[PDB]
Symmetry: D2
Subunit: 212 residues, 4 copies
C-alpha cells in the first residue's frame, strides 16, 4: 500500500498567488506518479510578523487571503499556528510542531520552490543540522523554477546527496514565474493582477486596503 503524506509550505504568502497554489498540485501529482505515496493533505503556513525586514501585510490578513484562495481546494488548508506564535521560528521547528499534531502515521514533507533549495548554500543562512533534519527526519518536495538546477544543488550538497530518497524533484512543465513582489507593485500602481491570484483574494485586498 501507499505511504500517507502531508505537504507543508512555509513562506510569506504576501499575498498568496496562483503559483503558490499550483506548487501543491504539481507536488501531489508527482508524488502520486511515483506510486509510493498518497498525499492526504496540504498545509499553507504563513510566516510570523516578526520575521525579517519587509512590508509584510499583517499575518491575520495573509492567513485570511490564503483561506479564501483555498476555499475551492478539497485537500489544502491554511494553518495559522506559525503566524500566531510570539516570535518567528526556524522552519524545522514548524515541521516538528506539525509532525506532533499528526501523531496527536503520515510522513510530513516540506514543500518549496527550487529557489528555496538554493538558499541551503548561503553562508550563515541555514544550520547544517536543520538541513539534515529536514531531509532525514522529514522530507523535501521541490518544484522547479526558471534558472535553478535542483539536481545540481542536491549533488553538490554533502548533506542533501546523502538523503536523496527523501527529496522529490517535481518538474513544472509550465513557465509560471509570478512573483508576489511584482503583484504588490502592480496593486500599488493600481494595475490588474486578475488571473494571477484568486479573485476572492483580490476582493479581500481591495476591501481591506492592502498593498496601497
Amino acid at each position: 500500500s501507499r505511504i500517507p503524506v502531508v505537504l507543508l509550505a512555509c513562506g510569506s504568502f504576501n499575498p498568496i498567488t496562483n503559483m503558490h497554489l499550483r506548487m501543491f498540485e504539481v507536488a501531489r501529482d508527482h508524488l502520486h506518479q511515483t506510486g509510493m505515496y498518497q498525499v492526504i493533505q496540504g498545509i499553507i503556513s504563513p510566516v510570523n510578523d516578526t520575521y525579517g525586514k519587509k512590508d509584510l501585510a499583517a499575518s491575520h490578513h495573509r492567513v485570511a487571503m490564503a483561506r479564501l484562495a483555498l476555499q475551492t481546494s478539497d485537500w489544502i488548508r491554511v494553518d495559522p499556528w506559525e503566524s500566531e506564535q510570539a516570535q518567528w521560528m526556524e522552519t524545522v521547528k514548524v515541521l516538528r510542531h506539525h509532525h506532533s499534531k499528526l501523531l496527536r502515521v503520515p510522513e510530513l514533507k516540506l514543500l518549496c520552490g527550487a529557489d528555496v533549495l538554493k538558499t541551503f548554500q548561503t553562508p550563515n543562512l541555514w544550520k547544517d543540522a536543520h538541513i539534515q533534519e529536514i531531509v532525514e527526519k522529514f522530507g523535501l518536495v521541490c518544484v522547479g523554477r526558471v534558472s535553478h538546477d535542483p539536481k545540481g544543488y542536491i549533488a553538490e550538497s554533502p548533506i542533501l546527496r546523502m538523503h536523496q530518497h527523501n527529496i522529490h524533484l517535481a518538474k513544472e512543465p509550465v513557465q509560471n514565474e509570478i512573483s508576489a513582489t511584482y503583484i504588490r507593485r502592480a496593486l500599488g500602481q493600481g494595475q490588474s493582477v486578475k488571473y494571477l491570484i484568486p479573485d476572492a483574494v483580490i476582493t479581500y485586498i481591495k476591501d481591506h486596503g492592502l498593498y496601497t
Copy 2:
C-alpha cells in the same frame, strides 16, 4: 477625452486558460496607461469547428467554458457569432462583423499574443490586404510572449511599420507560458490543471467528459 476601445480576441480557446484571460487585463492596463484610450469591452470569439485540422472540442463547449471563465469579469464577454457561422472565416471578416454590430463610436482592435504577430510573415498564411486592413481600418494590441520580438516583427514588415500608431505592444512582466496543448495533454493523463485555468472550466470539462 479618451477614445472608446473594444478588444476582440480570436483563437481556439480549447480550452480557455488563465493566460488567455490575463491577456485582456494586460492589454487594457496598457491602453489606459497611454492616456489616449478607455477600454469599454473585451470579446472572446472562439473559432468555428470547420477550422483547420485538430482535436477541437465542439464549439458550444468552448463557448460555454469561456462564458464560465468570464463570469467574474465585468467587461469581457464571449460572443459565439463566429463559431456559429456555417464555415470558418478569416479574421478580418470577424472584425468587420463586430465593427458593424458596434455601429448598430468605439475603435475595434484585434487582441493577440506576440506569436500570432510572427505568423504575419508565414508565406501563404495571411493575405497582405488583410494585414493592412487590420492595422489600418482597425488596430492591433499585442501581448508579449517568451522568445518573440514584436518590435522587430513590426520594423521588418513593410505593412506593419507604416501603421505603428494603430499597433500597441503591451509588455507582460510575468512569465506565464501556459499552452492549451499542455492543458489538454495533462487532462488526458488525469493530471491537475487547477490554478492554470478557471475552477468552473475544470468542472465543466469533468462534467462533460472533455479532453479524455
Copy 3:
C-alpha cells in the same frame, strides 16, 4: 552497434546564433544517450533568397556567417546547396538531396525547434504527404522551446502519432530564448549582441555592414 546519424537543420540563420548552434549539441547528446545512435555530422542549410516575405541578408552572407560560426565545431558544417538553387525548395526536397549525397547508409534526420513542429498543424502550410515522408523516411529531432508542448503536438496529429518512434524529443533545463529577430534589431540600434552569437559572426557583420 549504433545507427549512424546525420542531422540537418534548415532555416534562415539570419544570422546564425548561439542558440541555433546549441540546438545541434543538445540533439546529439540526446540521440547518444538513447544508446542506439551515433551522430556523425551536422549540416546547417540556410534558406534560399527567394523564400518568403521577410527581407533576409543575402544567402552569400548567411552561408559565410555559418561557416565562420562553425570553424570551432569538429562535426557541424554549413552546406550552401539549398541556397544556391534557382528558387526556394520544400524541406522534404532538401532532405532527399542530402540523403542522395550520403549514397550501410546513415539515417538523415531533420533537426528543428518545437515551434517548427507546431507549424505542421497550420492549415495549408505543409502537404500531408511531406509531413509523412519527413517523419517516416527521415526522422525528426525536436529541441524544446518555452511555450511549446511537443508531446501534445505529436499525440494530436495522427501522422506524427503513427510515426512517433521516428520523432526524438530533446531538451535541456536551460531557458535560452534568443531570437534572431531580436539580434537584428539590436544590431540595427548599435547595441551589443556579444555572447548571444559567435564572435566570428559579429566580426563579419561589422566588416560587411550587415543588419543596418
Copy 4:
C-alpha cells in the same frame, strides 16, 4: 561630458558562462543609453576559495578561465586580487580596494543580477551599513532575471529607495537563464556545454580535468 564608469562583477564564476559575460555587455549599453555615462572598463573578480559551503573549483582555475573567456573582449578583464587574499572578503571591501586602485575619478559600480539584489532582504545576510555604502558611494547596475522584480525590491527597501538614483536597472528581451550549476552537472555527465560557455573555457576545463 559623460561620467566615466568602471563595472565590477563579484561572484563564483564556477565556471564563467556566456550569461556572466552578456551581463557586462547589457549593463554597458544601458548606462550608455542614459546618455550620461561612459563605461571604460569591466572587472570580473572571482571569489576567494575560503568562501561559503559549496565546493568550488580552485580560484587559480576560475581566474584562468575568466582570463581565457575574456581574450576576445577589449574592455573586460579578470582581476585576481580578491581571490588571492588570505580569506573571503565582504563585497564592500572589494569595492573599496578597486576604488583605491582607480586613485576626476571614474565612478565604480557593482554589477550583478536581480537575484543578488533580492538577497539584500535576507535576514542577517548583509550589514545595513554595507548596503548603504554600496548604493551610495559606489552604485549598482542590476541586470534583469526571470522571476525577479527589481523595481519592487527597490521600492520596499528604505535604503535602496532613498538612493535609487544610484541603482541602474538594465534588461534585454532575451530569456537567458543558464546556471553555472547546470553547466557543472552537465560537464560531470559528459554532456556538451558548447555555446553556453566560451570555447576557450571548455578547452581549459578539458585540459585540466575540471568538474569531474
